[PDB]
Automatic annotation (TrEMBL):
Residues represented out of the complete protein: 208 to 472 of 507
Keyword Hydrolase part of the UniProt annotation: no
Keyword line: Cell wall, Membrane, Peptidoglycan-anchor, Secreted, Signal, Transmembrane, Transmembrane helix
Domain of life from the UniProt record: Bacteria
Name this protein carries in UniProt: LPXTG-motif cell wall anchor domain protein
Keyword Translocase recorded: no
Amino acid sequence: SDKKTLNDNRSHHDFTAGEKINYSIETVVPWNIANKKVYTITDNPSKGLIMDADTIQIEGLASNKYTVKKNADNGFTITIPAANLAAFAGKTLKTTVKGHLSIEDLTLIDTGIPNKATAKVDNEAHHEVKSEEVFTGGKKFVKVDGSNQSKTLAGAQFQLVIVKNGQVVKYAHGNEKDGYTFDTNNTNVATKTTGENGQFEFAGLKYSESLEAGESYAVKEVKAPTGYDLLKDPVLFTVTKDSYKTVQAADGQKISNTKKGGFLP
Ligand SMILES: [Cl-]
Ligand code: NA
Ligand code: NA
């Protein structure tokens, strides 16, 4: 029978926004396909998952034998003239495709997001199939005064970075919608600014347990709040299942700041 499989050989299925997720779709081609008109596969990803229509491949069928259309739900439709499947009569057709997470709604962080697909022969649909769920996480922070942790601070800017062996080794670029990339380029870095409530966050990150050996997430201050000294060192944090969705923003990880002297104008 039909199947859609997440190809991910881990016990946890956490991804960073933008990271490629591999799927395979297997669909039955009926014995009588040659006497039909059309074979359709429709992919309907759950909200938060985008399918990459340019990544579709069908085993044993060339790209000039079918049509791919991108759809408004971020899925796609494959249309195959039934004649082109005559040699697959009674067999399983195997499609591979990639997708990625793009979060436009923050209520989707720490929720399971499945892919779904349905094959149809002429007007007769098969049962919809669903893959395993993927997840993405995040972390919430509050910028406070070191000597009065009730006092939240505006105007702090923080970059997302990775640390290892006592050094910043990678800088994040992008965001939870557009996707993140991490590399050694310390420009165009993913950055957040605090308002008067001191709040900021980074969402759409895989769990810390999925990072390379020895690596940690950290936030690096690059602009201090007014009246405060720029922190010397990054601040480490951990992303785990439900680390984002189970705290209100005001209860984020507190980051302490120390007051500084002024200058003469
Ligand atoms: Cl911001
Ligand atoms: Na298929
Ligand atoms: Na999925």
